[PDB]
Design a protein around this ligand. Structure first.
Ligand SMILES: O=C(NO)c1ccccc1
Ligand SMILES: [Zn+2]
Length: 225
């Protein structure tokens, strides 16, 4: 399976967000949507909330052309898992997206940026088309944590074709950084694209997923316990 860390489309720039959705996600998506900016979201199943409790955010995200991909169910250190454990960690997110959205993801980003040959083999066997890394880090999960002003200033020098790592579980990323950096990036000539579009893969959201069935209605299986 191919590993990607840099866009190829001239002028493109990928704002990417890990570990969500979360309690500020509706705000984040409204900010992106108001600027016609597209985000890439690498979601968990049970980590900072249960994915089924975020179904409405996920549906808005899906239907507005944002890119949704897997970050594993439980945010595991994948280099420590067996083939079978990793397959389960991916299957569980696939199943949630099948229930909520009717589709399976074709892409994923490994927690901690940690992967190996077992990870790549599981991805190949499960039909994934790509493992998505990054090439610039906002620092929003560094500890001690930089200020929003520091993060915004770092964004002023991230060049074209950046795939930027952010975490939507950080309130200041949603409330301070992204509202400041969208105009910085758009006004200097960058196109805020999803990762597949910026890689010269398809710009059609339907090509980022495999349709399995019609989206489900919420029932008692929409649970993480
Ligand atoms: O899982 C992660 N981000 O979503 C991660 C964690 C540590 C370092 C780099 C990335
Ligand atoms: Zn993560």
């Amino acid at each position: 399976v191919p590993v990607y860390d840099t866009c190829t489309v001239p002028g493109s720039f990928a704002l990417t967000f890990d570990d969500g959705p979360y309690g500020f996600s509706t705000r984040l998506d409204s900010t992106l949507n108001a600027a016609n900016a597209k985000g890439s979201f690498f979601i968990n199943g049970q980590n900072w909330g249960c994915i089924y409790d975020y179904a409405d955010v996920l549906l808005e995200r899906f239907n507005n052309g944002h890119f949704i991909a897997s970050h594993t169910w439980s945010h595991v250190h994948m280099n420590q898992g067996t083939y079978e454990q990793l397959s389960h960690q991916l299957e569980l997110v696939e199943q949630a997206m099948i229930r909520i959205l009717g589709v399976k993801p074709l892409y994923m980003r490994p927690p901690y940026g940690e992967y190996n040959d077992v990870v790549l083999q599981v991805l190949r066997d499960r039909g994934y088309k790509g493992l998505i890394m990054w090439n610039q880090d906002s620092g929003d999960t560094f500890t001690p944590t930089p200020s929003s002003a520091q993060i915004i200033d770092s964004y002023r020098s991230f060049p074209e074709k950046t795939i930027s790592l952010n975490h939507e579980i950080k309130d200041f990323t949603v409330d301070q950084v992204i509202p400041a950096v969208i105009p910085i990036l758009q006004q200097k000539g960058f196109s805020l694209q999803t990762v597949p579009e910026c890689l010269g893969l398809s710009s059609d959201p339907a090509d980022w997923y495999v349709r399995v069935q019609e989206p489900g209605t919420r029932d008692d299986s929409w649970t993480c316990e």
